[PDB]
Write a protein that binds this ligand. Structure first.
Ligand SMILES: N=C(N)Nc1cccc([C@H](CP(=O)(O)CCCc2ccccc2)C(=O)O)c1
Ligand SMILES: [Zn+2]
Length: 305
């Protein structure tokens, strides 16, 4: 039950943590909920930064995919590092003064609970589907970006089911609703996954390249170089379609086509030795090196608005 930053925490524990870290840091963190899940859990959002007028923001979510436990761990790690180093480390101090980080600790809460209780390898949501006993939609194929046109299934029984319609899932509708309602301020979108050690940018739903792909490639390149300084961990990077494989309906592509010009999917450790079942013993090293890339991106975005 007790929360630890070097262990994977269950939802009850993460929920208690969002309340605790917010009460302990009132001038640095506010908590709201942006929606409920299919099974009635609260989708918490943390706003991290020193409040002020007309602040730009960066949006980061974790836990799209239930089994990718290091993703959830990173969002929690980020929040503590922000509050611990504010006022002492120049860069984080400037970040929190000038912008807000929206941190969504766990999007697909229902699936995450399922990985703790029944099936460690679950990935989808846990919503019911008409006409079948098969459960769940892949939330990262459920966005309105070339929806269900490639790299996706129309069968609810498949792991890549794109859903009955774009934003059919309460969770993805809640996230899209929030982003749409905050487009004027959100300057970047970061979505945290594992595994494969990559930084992806648009597009995945099509082989076409984003208008600013040269810029996005240079930024990804610089970010993976920064990440490698700590433990030598090697990341690859590029447009999703060629860097992994085509897949429609992803939140990074959707956010980009909303006008959020800096949109990245992070795939964290490792490369397949442990895969989704990354040992807790690697949480600290993974989070620490990932922090460097996230901060590099953040500084770049701040210098380009
Ligand atoms: N919009 C996007 N970024 N779409 C996208 C493109 C390629 C891959 C993915 C995800 C990757 P993921 O988050 O589950 C991590 C997959 C890790 C992996 C890697 C190799 C073999 C088996 C498993 C997917 O397969 O749904 C999304
Ligand atoms: Zn994933």
């Amino acid at each position: 039950t007790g929360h630890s930053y070097e262990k994977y925490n269950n939802w009850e524990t993460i929920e208690a943590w969002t309340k605790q870290v917010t009460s302990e840091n009132p001038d640095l963190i506010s908590r709201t909920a942006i929606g409920t899940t299919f099974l009635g859990n609260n989708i918490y959002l943390l706003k991290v930064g020193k409040p002020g007028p007309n602040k730009p923001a960066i949006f980061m979510d974790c836990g799209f995919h239930a089994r990718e436990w290091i993703s959830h761990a990173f969002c929690q790690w980020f929040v503590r590092e922000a509050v611990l180093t504010y006022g002492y480390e120049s860069h984080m101090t400037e970040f929190l003064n000038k912008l807000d980080f929206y941190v969504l600790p766990v999007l697909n809460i229902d699936g995450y609970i399922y990985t703790w209780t029944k099936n460690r390898m679950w990935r989808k949501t846990r919503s019911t589907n008409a006409g079948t006993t098969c459960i769940g939609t892949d939330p990262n194929r459920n966005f309105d970006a070339g929806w269900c046109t490639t790299g996706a299934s129309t069968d609810p029984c498949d792991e890549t089911y794109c859903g009955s319609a774009a934003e059919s899932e309460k969770e993805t509708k809640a996230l899209a609703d929030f982003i749409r309602n905050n487009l004027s301020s959100i300057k970047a979108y970061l979505t945290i996954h594992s595994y494969s050690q990559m930084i992806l940018y648009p597009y995945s739903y099509d082989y076409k390249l984003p208008e600013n792909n040269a810029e996005l490639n240079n930024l990804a390149k610089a970010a993976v170089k920064e990440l490698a300084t700590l433990y030598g961990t090697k990341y690859t990077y590029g447009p999703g379609a060629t860097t992994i494989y085509p897949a429609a309906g992803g939140s990074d592509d959707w956010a980009y086509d909303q006008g959020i010009k800096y949109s990245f999917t992070f795939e964290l450790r490792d490369k397949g030795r442990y895969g989704f079942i990354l040992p807790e013993s690697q949480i600290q090293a993974t989070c620490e090196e990932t922090m460097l890339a996230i901060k590099y991106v953040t500084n770049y975005v701040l210098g380009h608005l």
